[PDB]
Design an enzyme around this catalytic site. Sequence first.
Site, PDB file in Angstrom:
ATOM      1  CD  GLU A 166       9.011  25.192  28.777  1.00 13.60           C
ATOM      2  OE1 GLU A 166       9.761  24.343  29.414  1.00 13.60           O
ATOM      3  OE2 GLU A 166       8.207  24.829  27.698  1.00 13.60           O
ATOM      4  CG  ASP A 205      10.558  17.004  30.953  1.00 14.86           C
ATOM      5  OD1 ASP A 205      10.388  15.996  31.711  1.00 14.86           O
ATOM      6  OD2 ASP A 205      10.822  17.276  29.864  1.00 14.86           O
ATOM      7  CG  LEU A 207      14.149  16.552  25.497  1.00  9.37           C
ATOM      8  CD1 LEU A 207      13.870  16.135  27.019  1.00  9.37           C
ATOM      9  CD2 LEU A 207      12.982  15.793  24.437  1.00  9.37           C
ATOM     10  CG  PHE A 245       9.092  26.002  22.907  1.00 13.03           C
ATOM     11  CD1 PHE A 245       9.543  25.613  24.108  1.00 13.03           C
ATOM     12  CD2 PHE A 245      10.241  26.550  22.134  1.00 13.03           C
ATOM     13  CE1 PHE A 245      10.656  25.601  24.893  1.00 13.03           C
ATOM     14  CE2 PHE A 245      11.750  26.932  22.948  1.00 13.03           C
ATOM     15  CZ  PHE A 245      11.644  26.544  24.119  1.00 13.03           C
ATOM     16  CB  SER A 297      -8.226  21.649  19.603  1.00 16.96           C
ATOM     17  OG  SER A 297      -8.819  20.584  20.469  1.00 16.96           O
ATOM     18  CG  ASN A 314     -11.620  19.378  21.299  1.00 18.20           C
ATOM     19  OD1 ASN A 314     -10.630  19.111  21.037  1.00 18.20           O
ATOM     20  ND2 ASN A 314     -12.568  18.375  21.345  1.00 18.20           N
TER      21      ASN A 314
END
EC number: 3.2.1.17
Length: 162
Positions: free
Chosen positions: A11, A20, A32, A104, A117, A132
């Site tokens: 990040e 972002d 965020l 996250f 998945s 996948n």
Amino acid sequence: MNIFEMLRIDEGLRLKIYKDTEGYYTIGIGHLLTKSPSLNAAKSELDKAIGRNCNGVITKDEAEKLFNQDVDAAVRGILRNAKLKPVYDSLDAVRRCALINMVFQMGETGVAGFTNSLRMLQQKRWDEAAVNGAKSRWYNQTPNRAKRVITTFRTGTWDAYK
Ligand SMILES: [Cl-]
């Protein structure tokens, strides 16, 4: 290597409000603030979160505090989620970190959408799951980050990050 170091790599760290990858207002270590086009709304969210008049800028300490809150929230969120918990419980420590990373980044809901998945992870079919999970918007939008997480799930080691 641990979750914090892992996410810190994925990040970055920014002390000033920023957009972002999808154009949303964010700050610190991937925190965020809002999905609204308004910087005002962002700046408002920021102050509310920090509890001070920030004027779109925070300190390192403040960024780390938000980060501590977000990681904890992610984990608790997973442990509360009927769909996620069982998957989490079935995994080894490294792969659990990978699940936390995704949560996250995209939220519990976003992750829960990897139904297929996730079912493969649960059955310890490493390669299939990786293949996948790559068929997703997530992969196409942030491919290098996605690749790192996917390799983590496939191999169960920290290689992608070292
Ligand atoms: Cl696709």
